[PDB]
Amino acid sequence: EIENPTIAASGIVSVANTSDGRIEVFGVGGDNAVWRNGQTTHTGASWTGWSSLGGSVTSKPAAYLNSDGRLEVFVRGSDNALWHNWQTTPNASWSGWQSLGGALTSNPAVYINADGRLEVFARGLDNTLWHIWQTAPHSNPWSSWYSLGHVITSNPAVHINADGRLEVFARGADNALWHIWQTAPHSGYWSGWHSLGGVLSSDPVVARTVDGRLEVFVRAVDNALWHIWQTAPNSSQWSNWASLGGTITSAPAVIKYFDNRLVVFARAIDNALWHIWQNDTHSGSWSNWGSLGGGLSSGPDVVENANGYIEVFVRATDNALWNIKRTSPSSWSSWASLGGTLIDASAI
Amino acid sequence: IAASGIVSVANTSDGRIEVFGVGGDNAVWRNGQTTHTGASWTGWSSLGGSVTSKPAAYLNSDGRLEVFVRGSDNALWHNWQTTPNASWSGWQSLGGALTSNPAVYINADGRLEVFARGLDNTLWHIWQTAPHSNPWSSWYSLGHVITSNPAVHINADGRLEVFARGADNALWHIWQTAPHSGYWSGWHSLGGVLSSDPVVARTVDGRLEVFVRAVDNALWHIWQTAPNSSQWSNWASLGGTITSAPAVIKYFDNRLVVFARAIDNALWHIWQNDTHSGSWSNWGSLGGGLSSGPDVVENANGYIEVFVRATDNALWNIKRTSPSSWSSWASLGGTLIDASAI
Ligand SMILES: CO[C@@H]1O[C@@H](C)[C@@H](O)[C@@H](O)[C@@H]1O
Ligand SMILES: CO[C@@H]1O[C@@H](C)[C@@H](O)[C@@H](O)[C@@H]1O
Ligand SMILES: CO[C@@H]1O[C@@H](C)[C@@H](O)[C@@H](O)[C@@H]1O
Ligand SMILES: CO[C@@H]1O[C@@H](C)[C@@H](O)[C@@H](O)[C@@H]1O
Ligand SMILES: CO[C@@H]1O[C@@H](C)[C@@H](O)[C@@H](O)[C@@H]1O
Ligand SMILES: CO[C@@H]1O[C@@H](C)[C@@H](O)[C@@H](O)[C@@H]1O
Ligand SMILES: CO[C@@H]1O[C@@H](C)[C@@H](O)[C@@H](O)[C@@H]1O
Ligand SMILES: CO[C@@H]1O[C@@H](C)[C@@H](O)[C@@H](O)[C@@H]1O
């Protein structure tokens, strides 16, 4: 069996914007339960503190905002089935845990189709890519499970093309970046598999540029941040792999700045939070790596807050969730503890 | 009503502004940024047709632009990209008998839905039967009597909500009972005395806010007190003496910015100082000589772009170029007419 390098450490929480402009974070507690924390209001003046959604889980959770404004959380259960939990009205009471069945061997990843139906992707018992979907927009019930085939050796990553076609990425048995896409938006058909090559030592992490090009970030076997991109929207042509250097020890976290420039965050060999950023959205010019310090026991996860500024979440050495955020166009916040005790329940 | 904007302004799925106006021949003409940097424009191309309303462009969730306009026969007509950012379909009739500009929004299920005043002066609507696809429903009346072009937005919970001035010149609104539920609410009055179309934004914290010119020619606004709120604020005056429909857009930090032509026919703007206190700036001039209201969009650099017709009847452009700077006033040329149906 081709040997697959250990994937870079995952982030500690699923970070989601609510329909009322607040950050909500979902992590796994010492009791194996999903625990939640969120801003009291969109100004982010304070947080609610940790409350338990309960359950007993065996993956990193994945939260997603339905097109009717209700958050929904996906996780692999004690039984290796997919379980989910939804707000019953926006930013209100939670449903409790419902089984969607299956036999999963990775974290679940979620995206929304061009018709408002959520669709979840996970490695199945046979190590092929599996998927499942809402049968109606922002609503139960769900399909049964289907295999898209292949052999994958990482958690899958999912995004949507400029033309509304979902596209999923994973490391293959050969360590290359593999991907597959809907033939047209929720057409009922997928394209078959394409290798982008490379030798990955992390999950793929996918953004769409403001001009509509998918761009994928990975740690490679040299422990550098590498990336690769569509040459145009929906393009039949990808770039060559290009190194951004560094010695990173986490999955990269990617977000567009308020001016749409890509910014990548990762833990480095010194256990600090580091970041590197586009100088512009076309020429392909990137900055040098800048440290933001801290002592990280996980990868970062990132969201844009209601002030239009980047917020970053990590687990610290005290196993609490820590937060650092932009406070203006020209300044970072102080490191602050949001407390809690979080375990890394990442499935791979 | 207060003078309308001259163009429908829409972002493409490949991060370029496209503008759609009516030429002196009554055809729909379009102009686009050559790339997402917005450094240059293609120049004007004709989509043809003979039109009797302002066009309304909208991006389908499959990334294809689509333009809606009232035809010579007062029916709704539409023209769509057959693939994203490529060739146009030409003009197809969706029938009906319309007495206003069409306004368009996308449902939580990816179906476009078009609102216009009908032959009996009630609110009419029509929708795609499947997401981002033909064919369309037949026409249905949601009733009432309206005296302005309708405006449409979506609540934080995915319910479409439509705004129109009534025969009392008050702001009226009606909403889906739930996202694309098949049912709508009763008509409700938010009062006031409007002298323009309503223009609607949704705040970053998920509250609908409506801007109007009032009978005193001042900018006024009213807002939901909370997302999906069963309670709105009182009307509040932002003052000024404006001679166009206002145009509203969130800044990169989500502060609302409102643009309007003033009595001096210059482009003026006023903005929130923050998104939690109801505190607004003073009016600031950006100058120009305007023969229309402004239309606004956020470009692929994440900055506000503004489009107005000038005294020469050309389309002019001013935009933010950074966190700290405006662009030059640039002429995109052409000759545009105001084909607004009301
Ligand atoms: C705030 O509560 C603390 O953090 C949670 C995430 C859980 O690990 C819990 O057992 C612990 O007591
Ligand atoms: C509430 O149910 C508990 O949590 C779920 C997420 C599943 O792991 C299930 O097996 C377990 O009993
Ligand atoms: C109904 O869901 C649609 O059809 C299924 C058969 C799958 O192809 C899925 O990716 C797609 O969104
Ligand atoms: C149709 O799908 C498009 O072309 C394919 C050949 C791939 O390059 C894919 O990334 C892209 O989305
Ligand atoms: C560029 O062409 C000019 O502007 C167009 C919008 C039309 O009004 C046309 O008749 C005129 O010649
Ligand atoms: C292309 O067809 C022309 O333009 C349409 C928008 C309609 O006004 C129609 O009656 C006219 O003949
Ligand atoms: C299918 O379309 C849905 O049902 C129709 C009967 C209308 O109520 C419409 O607003 C809604 O989007
Ligand atoms: C259910 O609809 C909500 O409550 C209504 C009574 C109105 O305030 C409306 O703006 C809002 O969307």
Residue numbers in the entry:
A (entry chain A): 23 to 370
B (entry chain D): 29 to 370
Verbatim from the authors:
The newly characterized lectins PLL, PLL4, and PLL5 were produced recombinantly in Escherichia coli and were purified by affinity chromatography. The PLL chain A blade W1 interacts with chain B blade W3, whereas in the case of PLL2, PLL4 and PLL5, chain A blade W1 interacts with chain B blade W5. The PLL is a tetramer in solution (sedimentation coefficient 7.6 S); PLL4 and PLL5 form dimers in solution (sedimentation coefficients: PLL4 = 4.9 S and PLL5 = 4.7 S). PLL preferred branched fucosylated saccharides (BLeY and ALeY); PLL4 and PLL5 preferred MGMR. The PLL5 gene exhibited negligible expression under the conditions tested, raising questions about its inducibility. Among the PLL family, PLL5 had the most pronounced effect on basal PO activity (one-way ANOVA, P-value <0.001), elevating it to levels comparable to those seen with full activation of the PO system. Nonetheless, the extent of PLL5-induced melanisation under natural infection is uncertain due to low pll5 gene expression in early bacterial growth stages. Interestingly, PLL5 was observed to reduce ROS production in PMA-induced response, although a significant variability was noted among blood samples, likely reflecting inter-individual differences among blood donors. The mechanism by which PLL5 inhibits PMA-induced ROS production remains unknown, but it highlights PLL5’s unique activity among other PLLs.
